[PDB]
Design a protein around this ligand. Structure first.
Ligand SMILES: [Ca+2]
Ligand SMILES: [Ca+2]
Ligand SMILES: [Ca+2]
Ligand SMILES: [Ca+2]
Lengths: 49, 49
């Protein structure tokens, strides 16, 4: 007696939470400790991490 | 007459303590009598590294 509207459903959800990367900074204080940078000087400074 | 010097020190001479003495050869003009005459030399650091 009923004319069914033939439509059933399925569903799902997608969760995009974080950003791809975290650029953790540990800044450099390049004259350093137990060192010295003078005017006109020339050299190299290294920070591994 | 020749008024400029260009003394340059490198990694071995600095790393031992650089002393610059003076040796003066002089002849006083005939009959001149003075007291406490000044002698002034300008030290320019032109290029360091
Ligand atoms: Ca993040
Ligand atoms: Ca320089
Ligand atoms: Ca240097
Ligand atoms: Ca030398």
């Amino acid at each position: 007696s009923v004319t069914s509207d033939r439509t059933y459903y399925g569903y799902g959800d997608v969760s995009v939470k974080n950003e791809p990367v975290n650029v953790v900074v540990s800044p450099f204080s390049f004259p350093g400790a137990n060192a010295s940078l003078s005017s006109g000087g020339q050299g190299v400074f290294k920070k591994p991490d | 007459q020749h008024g400029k010097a260009w003394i340059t020190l490198d990694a071995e001479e600095l790393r031992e303590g650089a002393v610059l003495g003076a040796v003066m050869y002089y002849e006083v003009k005939e009959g001149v009598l003075a007291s406490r005459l000044p002698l002034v030399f300008k030290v320019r650091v032109v290029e360091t590294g």
